């Protein structure tokens, strides 16, 4: 199996993130996706949880009261589990926009590869089960996901989901949830990322 693209995702995109809390003996660790500059992707259910007082990413500590610029993605007025967060000034992330987005839909039963830094680095995989308008979760309804047949675990949220369409493999999701042997990831589109990055002021050149 060619895994060159997934290896590049592990090398440049997926990183661990740990949220520190005052009501548990240990931090909550999962994965995050570096997009470009000072902007990354993270699950909304993790970001919005009220307990954490700081988090660490890329060797940096950030407190909850910092003036983060954020976008919470919605679909037809229903919340998704996807947040984009732009940090204050600091050392830049790689520009990983070449690794996100597919213009065609993945075929039924094609291979999904998850790329995680949640428990050290690892891959997981399962068959693509299709897009769903929403999932019903212990925290409410979330919109615009796709599913895959593989048992997933607490902490695996934020892992990059690499799918295949039109002879190319790209990241089109971030892991969100699990239910009885089936995982669900929140969909990522290139157009949505670009629109949100512009809203947050992450400076980029436009190819003309």
Numbering used by the authors: 4 to 211
From the paper:
Seneca virus A (SVA) is an emerging novel picornavirus that has recently been identified as the causative agent of many cases of porcine vesicular diseases in multiple countries. The full-length SVA genome is approximately 7.3 kb in length and contains a single open reading frame (ORF) encoding a single polyprotein that undergoes proteolytic processing and cleavage by the viral 3C protease (3Cpro) into four structural proteins (VP4-VP2-VP3-VP1) and eight non-structural proteins (L-2A-2B-2C-3A-3B-3C-3D). SVA 3Cpro is composed of two topologically equivalent antiparallel six-stranded β-barrel domains (A1-F1 and A2-F2). Three closely positioned residues (His48, Asp84 and Cys160) within the proteolytic active site of SVA 3Cpro comprise the canonical catalytic triad.
